[PDB]
Curated annotation (Swiss-Prot), chains C, E:
Interval of the full protein contained in this chain: 79 to 248 of 274
Miscellaneous comment in the UniProt entry for this protein: The active site is a conserved redox-active cysteine residue, the peroxidatic cysteine (C(P)), which makes the nucleophilic attack on the peroxide substrate. The peroxide oxidizes the C(P)-SH to cysteine sulfenic acid (C(P)-SOH), which then reacts with another cysteine residue, the resolving cysteine (C(R)), to form a disulfide bridge. The disulfide is subsequently reduced by an appropriate electron donor to complete the catalytic cycle. In this typical 2-Cys peroxiredoxin, C(R) is provided by the other dimeric subunit to form an intersubunit disulfide.
Subcellular location: Cytoplasm; Endoplasmic reticulum
One BP annotation, GO: male gonad development
Protein name per UniProt: Peroxiredoxin-4
Record PTM: The enzyme can be inactivated by further oxidation of the cysteine sulfenic acid (C(P)-SOH) to sulphinic acid (C(P)-SO2H) and sulphonic acid (C(P)-SO3H) instead of its condensation to a disulfide bond.
Gene source species: Mus musculus (Mouse)
Lineage start: Eukaryota, Metazoa, Chordata, Craniata, Vertebrata
């Protein structure tokens, strides 16, 4: 069922994302000419602190300077994404964030990337690296407990870029 | 794909609901011996005031007095269901509410009741009435914009339990 | 087997109706440009008073004034529809009525709207609301005992027309 | 889905609600075992065509009853429309009172089993079947919607069947 | 399997018939413009007196005066048909007869008219009435023992001729 | 559709035949223990002289004396088979005959034997030789014009009976 | 699987035959305008006297005088067909003969005519008569032991080309 | 279609072979306990000198002495095989020979060995060496013209025999 | 065709590995009761410095100390694995190493893990972390150029075994 | 599954070979116009003396002289072929050799030729002779232990060249 294959073109996706507090139509092709770090996380409004999403949002600049963008995705509706941002931390929210939050409500993107859990109705923790020519170069799939490293994602992006010229 | 047929047993469902600020496992079979008004609404945290859901929460006591329970369902996570209730009504939330909010995250229940929109990724505005022996007795499917009446739902339950009036002079043969 | 989907075009139909005491060929498209309340009822000439059919005939003036029409339908022949109308209320009849009675004798329309009961040989209690652009906007299906509200139908039609201009309001 | 009605095979089973002397009674084909049954379809109640053929059987039913024979009529109309028809006076468009049952085949099962249902019109041909005391179909008569039916020819036919059941092979 | 449907054109057939002792190629289309009584009987050279064939042969003139033609049919070879006619009535034959005897040897026509018995290898007693435009108007199927009324057959054509112009009127 | 295979059992058949002026139920198994010449001919009451059938009827004793029986078959009814026999030769008949005339009116036997003509509604000229064990040993099929040999049939039966004992 | 049906065209065949000590391509259509007796026999070099094959080779002039040729066939190679021919009859051979010996080594021809015995690896005793327009007119299939009569074959052919009733008999 | 796989048991075959002028039923299992050189050749009575087949017939004793038998096979009938053997080498024949000529008339053995040529109706030049345990050990397929070495075959068999003990 | 699903039991494998210079049958079930890092690398005897394999071999003790084992796999024969190890680092070889090198010569294992490249005939660079109960917990797949972090692998294993919030953050 | 048929064109193959110490892309069509001896052997770095592979490498000049080429093939990577050759004949290696070593890493060629073993993951000992027109002429399949004769291959090639004329 998964369309995501390494060194084949990354599966096309499109949907509504929340960017800087507004709804915007986002597509994989918007990021052509740049590397894109594309990752799924299970759910909004959970009891687990969203450290990993904040960590990417805070340090986004390290990505921007190496021609990389970052996009987060969950199966939550784009309306739920917003409420999370607009919900105070004492009550569980995310607060403002500097990466787009993409909604995969009809589950289609999750399924194409092969990270959807048929029975849970939400995603794995999956992260995909797609290059500037629009090709999937790396796949990371974690069981539900384990978080994700900003440093390690960076190491990977740089290594792909370095070998893009000299190998 | 739809399993809901009138006067056949209502399709079984079970899932996580938010009841009185807590997560509780809820299944259709829990409502045996009582009538159940089971209705879907599209999404939480929208910009449309959730009056229909609220109206049921406010007047929930009138259903209780005629042996009827009410459960609402959307395709949202129970975690989102919780946040909505915990978001003040003044700030766009649902606020506290006295009916359970059932989560159909894997979409399995929506599809069973035939209210899921494959391309939109959420439900219609759909309402089902089920009797105490667990049989589907009424189906209401609305296009997304139009809301839903408590009075009319009440009228229907009473009408299924009890059994507009005849013009004077009309007689049968 | 049912073809009726919300916000897809309402399924086409045509058949012979009794309108103001005459047989007339009626088709769904005749109601283009107006909202149509199209509803089924089980049978003519039963022993239960047709309160729901009469109530629509009496209050028809309220539907026409918001550019809405009403058509009732059963699996009975157009000839049985006529006899019913031409039979006095004191005699079990409907008496004269101001909405058309459409005959779905060969059961094709009932099947298309998904309200036909295979074993009983008649319809459910079903009501569909269709807009001026010919799109299905509402489906209501009741088990045999429970009747149908004119007020609630008027409310739905009004709500659909209203949101057709200002999309969603409190 | 096609006709089940075959000559000299057991007659297709049917059961449904009929109007008999103004009342609803559950009726089945097996109820007529031990007697010959004349079972026929007519298109619709409440038409502008005179129900002369249905009436003629009702008037002359006794000639059939005396030769160990029953007669039953059927249309695709509801038992309620059937009743309404009988209780409408004979000249002001009704059938008037009748002494044979009017079987309602509202769900069309019997009409399709007998191969007399018209898919597009939603009613029957004019068909008459003669069935014996062992429940075996012996005769099929199908008329285009316009032509009516002879009680007499039916009467003779019932008689010819009765004769050949005992002394059959010779003129 | 039967192609004979009431008020649709009668199933086409063609074959060799015996007419006045001669072999003749005969088709349904020869009877365009006239009413045709077309009927099957089980077998030739049987022990049952062939009265119905004779009775029709005798009164053929009444048919001709009301614009009706008649054709009899069995699954026997045309050759068997001939021997029968040429066999004296005293010897079990038909003797000469004034209606054509059409041969349906390859069983194709009995099957089209839905009158063939798979196991017997011959027909039921079946009669079909066809109008001047070639449309099937009546079907009569008798179990093998019972003979047939000329009179009733005569009546039916008249009822059809009568209702083709005025239609049934009270 | 033909069931007739050489040196496999000849296909079973059964039906009503006219044997010595009476109707009799005849079946292929009645000839167990004897060789059987089973042949088809097109029709009774034709304008062609029935020489081949009469030739078999006349010389039947030569067959009985080599433990062989003979049966003729056409698609005509047994009532027609009787009438033919009972029709004087002068008036076109067969006259009395000492071989059975099998009626295959429902065409079932012809179809089993591969001699039925779909379009004509009668048979080919076919002859099958079946042994004492009910096994088909020889198949002969002629186009409509050509008749059939008693001498040659006889030669064939003898050759089969001879080689049944001494190779 | 058999393609041979009466009064339909005889199934096409072509292959290498031994004709006058030589290999020649022979196909059914070479015999158009003539009747052909095309018959199969099981095997070359047996201990059974090839009386039936020889009889056809010998009396061949009688066929030729009624516009008919004869071709015999077995599943043996044309080489074996040849060797059979170059062995004297007294010494078990066929000796030289005046009908072609068609070789069906790959069994393709046999199968088309429905005479191949799947398990034995050779043919039945089968004989087919084909008319001058190339249409199959007669089929004779014998179990393995029993041979075939030239007289009878001849009789059949004349009758097909040609186209005696009990006394007192007349038709009606 | 070929059933013959290296180091799997050689495909079973059985049939009539010609041995010392006699017909004898022969099967592969008869050669258990001995190595068998089983080879196919196209046709009897061909115009090609049977040098390769005779060489095996002449030198058979070298095979018998290293516990090996040799059997040749063609699709020719056992009756054709005998005639070949009873035709003198001087007459285009094979003359008497001391290895069996196996007949694969119904082609079943050829097909099993994957050496039947569908359109020619005969075999390739194919050779199989099967060890004493009934296991296929060696496969050789030659174009139609080319003859075959006894010397070379013996070398291969011995090597198979040698490695049956050492390595 | 891939069998590797997260939080389902890891796909079974068995084959011959080279461990401390010897051939051994190694199977996934041998690592029951321990976490296993199971990773593929494309090929032996390449011109690319085999740093990632060596780095794991050098720091293997850190894994051993958190009850974790490491096994490397390539589609190379076990014989090639041995020659690699017995070829000096000075000569381009791997030299001795302290993790087993599993040979997947018939490609069967690679296909099960969905790491085989059909046209190239070897694997991408893929790593799987499997728990002590034998369940696949993590999948990492890299295009051929990019190596893999031991530190990062370590972080991951501890994380699975162990189981920092924005300030002000509290749950409902 | 095997596509290799006698007196039909040899199945096309192409891949990377090690030729006289270098990586080179090689295809069957390169041997158009000359005879080619194409043979498989199981694995590099085995414990079996590569006497059969070496014998062809040593006497290569006799094949070159009858317009014939020889190419050996195994399922090992080309990197492994090289490493093998660069391992001295004394240390268990093949040492330098004068026939190309073709790598069939993705198993595609072995399978086309019908010598791959699904369960073992390597080839049989199989050798094929293909003529100057690219037609498959001879097939040899040995169980894994047993070597192959240079002489008999030579005898066969010559016999084929001979019948190419007469």
């Amino acid at each position: 069922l998964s369309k995501a294959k390494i060194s084949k073109p990354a599966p096309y996706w499109e949907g509504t994302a929340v960017i800087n507090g507004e709804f915007k139509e986002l597509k994989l092709t918007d990021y052509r000419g740049k590397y894109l770090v594309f990752f799924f996380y299970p759910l909004d409004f959970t009891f687990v602190c969203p450290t990993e999403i904040i960590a990417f949002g805070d340090r986004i600049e390290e990505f921007k300077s190496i021609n990389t963008e970052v996009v987060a995705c969950s199966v939550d509706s784009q309306f739920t994404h917003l409420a999370w941002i607009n919900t105070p931390r004492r009550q569980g929210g995310l607060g403002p964030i500097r990466i787009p939050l993409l909604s995969d409500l009809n589950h289609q993107i999750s399924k194409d990337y092969g990270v959807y859990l048929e029975d849970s109705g939400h995603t794995l923790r999956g992260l995909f690296i797609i290059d500037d020519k629009g090709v999937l170069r790396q796949i990371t799939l974690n069981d539900l407990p384990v978080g994700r490293s900003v440093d390690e994602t960076l190491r990977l992006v740089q290594a792909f870029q370095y070998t893009d010229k000299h190998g």
